[PDB]
Amino acid sequence: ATVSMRDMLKAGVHFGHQTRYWNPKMKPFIFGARNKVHIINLEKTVPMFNEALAELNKIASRKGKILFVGTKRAASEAVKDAALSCDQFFVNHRWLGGMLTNWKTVRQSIKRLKDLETQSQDGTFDKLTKKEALMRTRELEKLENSLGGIKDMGGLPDALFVIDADHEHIAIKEANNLGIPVFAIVDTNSDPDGVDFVIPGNDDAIRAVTLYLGAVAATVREGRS
RNA sequence: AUGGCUGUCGUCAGCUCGUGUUGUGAAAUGUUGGGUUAAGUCCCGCAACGAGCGCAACCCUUAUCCUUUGUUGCCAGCGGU
């Protein structure tokens, strides 16, 4: 149920950014620098990866709801195959400022989505002209482009999973406000203090983000069972 | 001292609210930015997300055809003048 260090070496989890963009709040997780490129200290990560999954074992056991957040085009596709396979919720596109704290408004937009979603099945657009139908599908697709992965959310999620916290610092501000356990994949240039469960790793690699997703996929399915 | 009614900026495209967020606060954000339009009209980005009054549309007239009717209106196809 846990990953080995050998597989992570092939995954490229320790290939951080340069020594010019590094964040000084990551010193306890910085190994060295080769060709002026910081290496993630893998010794601290592996044990912290398990307790991160251990926390995932507890929340998923009590019918908990988790949220995978990643707005990078080099990670936007993996999260789609992740949440849909493990029966969860995700946000691959633009993280709206106010998805959590301003839920009383995003709740109605979901009703607006489901209003146009229900209108798309029966075919109500066939009696309206081409102008009214195209207009109702240009927003319906935009809400699918925004709230498409959280249509059946049902209230505030109980856990937050983030990919590269510094690129998602809007989501962490909302997570620390409501008191939600946030599990983030922090990079050498990212923000560690905002997240209580930090997982020092890389974000600009395809195989790196999937190795995390493969691990979190099984542990949450262990909670559903 | 007022109601109702009116002129003008101006038919200019702006004016605001609920929630969230930012700053001790007045307030800001939304309404900024790249393009675009007659126009905060529309798309994309974006700590903003939505909505309301406005703009637009629905109203009237004019322009083309068809259907319905033919008076006191009209006169082509046929006669008497």
| A96 CB-to-strand B distance under 7 Å | yes
- Strand B contact residues in chain A (25-64), C-beta within 7 Å: none
Dihedral sign for Cα atoms in the order A178, A181, A184, A189: positive
Method by which the coordinates were obtained: cryo-EM
Dihedral sign for Cα atoms in the order A178, A183, A184, A188: positive
| A190 CB-to-strand B distance under 7 Å | no
Task: Give the tokens for residue A109.
Answer: 């937009």
Round and report the angstrom distance from CA (A94) to C1' (B68): 60
- Strand B contact residues in chain A (132-161), C-beta within 7 Å: 138-139, 142-143, 145-146
- Closest nucleotide to A141: CA versus each C1': B43
The rounded distance, in Å, linking the Cα atoms of A13 and A208 is: 6
**Which of strand B's nucleotides are less than 7 A from any protein C-beta?**
18-22, 43-51
The contacts of residue A200 (CB under 8 Å, 6+ apart) are: A26, A29, A40, A41, A44, A45, A48, A186, A187, A188
Task: Give the tokens for residue A70.
Answer: 């990643």
Nearest residue by alpha-carbon distance to C1' of B19: A102
Rounded to an integer, what is the distance from CA A135 to the centroid of its chain?
Answer: 30
- At what resolution in Å was this solved? 3.2
The rounded distance, in Å, linking the Cα atoms of A208 and A217 is: 15
CB A172 within 8 A of CB A195: yes
Strand order in the sheet with A197-200: A89-91, A66-69, A159-163, A182-186, A197-200
Round and report the angstrom distance from CA (A51) to C1' (B74): 98
Round and report the angstrom distance from CA (A3) to C1' (B75): 101
The rounded distance, in Å, linking the Cα atoms of A219 and A225 is: 10
Residue A36 carries which DSSP code? S
